[PDB]
Amino acid sequence: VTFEPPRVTGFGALWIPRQQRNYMTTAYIEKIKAYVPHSNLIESGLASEAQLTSWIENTCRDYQVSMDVFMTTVLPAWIVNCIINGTSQERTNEHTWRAVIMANMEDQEVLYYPIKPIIVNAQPTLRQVMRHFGEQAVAQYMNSLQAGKPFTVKGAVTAGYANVQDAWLGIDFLRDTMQLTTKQMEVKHQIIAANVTRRKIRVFALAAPGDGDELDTERHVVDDVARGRHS
RNA sequence: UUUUU
Numbered sequence: 001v002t003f004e005p006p007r008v009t010g011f012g013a014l015w016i017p018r019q020q021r022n023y024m025t026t027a028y029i030e031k032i033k034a035y036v037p038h039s040n041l042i043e044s045g046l047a048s049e050a051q052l053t054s055w056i057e058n059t060c061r062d063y064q065v066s067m068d069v070f071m072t073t074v075l076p077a078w079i080v081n082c083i084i085n086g087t088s089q090e091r092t093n094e095h096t097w098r099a100v101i102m103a104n105m106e107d108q109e110v111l112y113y114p115i116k117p118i119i120v121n122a123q124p125t126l127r128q129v130m131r132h133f134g135e136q137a138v139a140q141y142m143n144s145l146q147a148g149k150p151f152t153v154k155g156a157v158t159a160g161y162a163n164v165q166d167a168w169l170g171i172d173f174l175r176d177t178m179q180l181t182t183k184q185m186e187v188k189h190q191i192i193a194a195n196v197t198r199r200k201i202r203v204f205a206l207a208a209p210g211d212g213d214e215l216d217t218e219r220h221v222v223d224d225v226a227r228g229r230h231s
Numbered sequence: 232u233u234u235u236u
Contacts, residue, residue: 044232070235087236124232155235172235194235 040177044108055122062117086154087127087172130173138168159191
């Protein structure tokens with residue numbers, strides 16, 4: 001059997017609906033084989049490109065800083081801060097998030113930035129807009145680990161995970177789109193079980209009272225009953 | 232989907 005044919009017939013076992021049999025050709029197979037987009041650009045768990053750039057442009061206008069200096073200077077600081085403290089929406093009560101200027105592995109001064117103009121501008125929640133930087137956050141935490149002064153991950157410490165070697169997987173903005181092995185899947189997921197620590201209520205206590213009974217009277221008569229004379 | 236202050 002020097003030659004063993006070529007097959008490559010495709011389809012066969014794969015059931016094809018009758019409406020698609022006229023377009024489900026062999027040449028159609030090769031056309032869709034090229035459509036393999038990144039598995040981190042299609043899911044709804046992250047902000048889309050249209051609303052990611054909206055977040056980038058809106059927050060730099062509020063800070064009155066250029067996009068070039070935003071993507072270079074304060075974005076890594078924001079990623080580090082989101083590594084230290086969580087990325088929850090109700091972090092706005094801090095009213096300020098801190099960035100520290102570093103001279104040579106030694107703090108010199110802490111800078112203060114408003115936290116509202118960076119959370120509300122993330123249209124599909126800030127937990128989703130920061131998921132694009134989840135892969136960069138792990139690398140930056142590893143860099144901090146190599147420097148001898150590891151970061152303190154809020155999720156890992158809160159969940160009870162004291163392992164500093166892999167204290168990530170406690171990052172609040174990991175979508176798990178990365179090829180996590182089965183031994184890190186449960187470590188990340190048990191940390192994710194910090195959600196059941198606190199409840200959530202969907203609706204507040206309404207607006208003010210619509211009405212509490214009204215009054216309408218005039219003239220000179222009894223206190224409340226207008227000329228009460230019936231029997 | 233949200234939910235990890």
